[PDB]
Design a protein around this nucleic acid. Structure first.
Ligand SMILES: [Ca+2]
Lengths: 48, 160, 80, 80
DNA sequence: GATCTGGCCTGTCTTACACAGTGATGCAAATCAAGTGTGAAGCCAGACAAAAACCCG
DNA sequence: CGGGTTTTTGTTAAGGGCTGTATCACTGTGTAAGACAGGCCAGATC
DNA sequence: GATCTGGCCTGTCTTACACAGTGATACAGCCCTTAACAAAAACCCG
DNA sequence: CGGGTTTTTGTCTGGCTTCACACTTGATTTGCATCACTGTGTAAGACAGGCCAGATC
């Protein structure tokens, strides 16, 4: 849905550089790191 | 983050959080393009380096003015790097599944993996405030997704 | 869902007796449909078809409260 | 902040941060209108009620239709 | 006597520039590997005698 | 293979304080519907 | 013979409407005390 | 207003822990300064309508 779009614009607005060259590399890095199982397991470590 | 870290260090005295050095170190550990691996076929038309991550998606598209002009910025990984990194951080999950479904850790493969793929455009991604509506700049991510890892041993297989 | 809403508009059309039909007749039939549905189910009828309203139309209460409009000698159990 | 608090509380076992209601009390101790005080002259045309916080900036204007129109939004503190 | 025109007057877009952010580099400084080896503090078992303060005859 | 004795928790009160999410009144905001504006023909018509 | 026309495609162009996010608000559950029975187990005798 | 009754407050004598330097000197990591680079909103800054009195057939 709009799910990726709001996430992508938020990643462009919060944590990103200028000159449009490092920008897409940074958003690819952060968007990759958001969806790894390892940190996801660290982040839902409250209910167990 | 650095402000928060230095304030908690100043208040607590002992250090609990971390500065950015070890953060970026563990980041490039977790990033693709870091761990070694191999292929039993030689993989024609594929490079042999195990240590390349982010590259241009253009794959050497010469965008000189004498040729067909584009402006679309494209960043990409290498595919096998993404596969091996996804495997290495689902390694604990598949270890626990192997310990759960009545097996040992010293098993060999060949583990059969089912991978779907997807890409979709997202419409506008732009916040133009200099004069208002400049361009409906449309962007698109292309992605993969693992959904099933199995191993066949003896007679049958098992969804590990 | 679009076909079900259409066949309800054509059954309030009762168009197995009216073979020809103008756009005014179908518009008035949709008008009577939204009037009776806002009187019975008291929902917000809209032509912007979504999934929630489509799921909202799929029950026996809806098929009852719409089928009771026409003099169905047969169409009741057919819709059922 | 709630996410960060619950994640570090889970991963250390100790509760190093604070939850949200304690944060609300810690901010209510720092807003205007909490401590008592008085004035040796009784401060004419000032309501001496001593627990007022964010009040409406318009001081009770006359936003009805039959009055001069004003569509601004003003929020203020009392000065004392 | 009645239009034409340079001169001011003033509410307009119009337009640059300095900084605020973003990450990532790059050294200089502090701190830590282990290595003995004393060796100065700190606390307790044994039983034995002073400072400081509030109440009652 | 089964009891005797020993080594550990549940059970409902009651009336609190504490905490962890669920909800609540809200806007804002993009992407599908589907409505419509033309664009281009096969046949009526001068 | 040439020209308008109804109809059929079709590429925009607006819009409702489903969610997203937020501080504040509202409960839904969780320790605490007698207490006298209710259970689970572990080991050992038998 | 002196003495009673607590309350601390020490005491050697021997007998335990327990880090502190002491360098050593070479990795490691830590802190802060620097770097590359656009976004934006602003206060100068012309600027042209507009309204004058001066000029003129
Ligand atoms: Ca889409």
């Amino acid at each position: 849905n709009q799910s990726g779009n709001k996430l992508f614009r938020r990643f462009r607005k919060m944590n990103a550089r200028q000159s449009k060259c490092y920008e897409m590399e940074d958003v690819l890095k952060h968007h990759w790191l958001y969806t790894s199982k390892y940190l996801q397991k660290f982040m839902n470590a409250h209910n167990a | 983050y650095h402000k928060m870290y230095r304030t908690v260090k100043a208040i607590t005295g002992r250090q609990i959080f971390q500065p950015l050095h070890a953060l970026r170190n563990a980041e490039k550990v977790l990033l693709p393009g870091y761990h070694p691996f191999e292929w039993q076929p030689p993989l024609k038309n594929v490079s042999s380096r195990t240590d390349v991550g982010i590259i241009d998606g253009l794959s050497g598209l010469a965008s000189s003015v004498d040729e067909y002009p584009v402006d679309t910025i494209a960043k990409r990984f290498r595919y096998d790097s993404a596969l091996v990194s996804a495997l290495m951080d689902m390694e604990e999950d598949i270890l626990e599944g192997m310990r759960s479904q009545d097996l040992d850790d010293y098993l060999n493969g060949p583990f059969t993996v089912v991978v779907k793929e997807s890409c979709d455009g997202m419409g506008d991604v732009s916040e133009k405030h200099g004069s208002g509506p400049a361009v409906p700049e449309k962007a698109v991510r292309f992605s993969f997704t693992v959904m099933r890892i199995t191993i066949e041993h003896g007679s049958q297989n098992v969804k590990v | 869902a679009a076909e079900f809403y259409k066949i309800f508009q054509l059954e309030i059309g009762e168009v197995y007796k009216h073979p020809n039909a103008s756009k005014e007749e179908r518009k008035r039939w949709q008008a009577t449909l939204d009037k009776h549905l806002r009187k019975r189910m008291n929902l917000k009828p809209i032509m912007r078809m979504n999934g929630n309203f489509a799921r909202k139309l799929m029950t026996q209460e809806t098929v009852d409260a719409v089928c009771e409009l026409i003099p169905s000698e047969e169409r009741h159990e057919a819709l059922r």
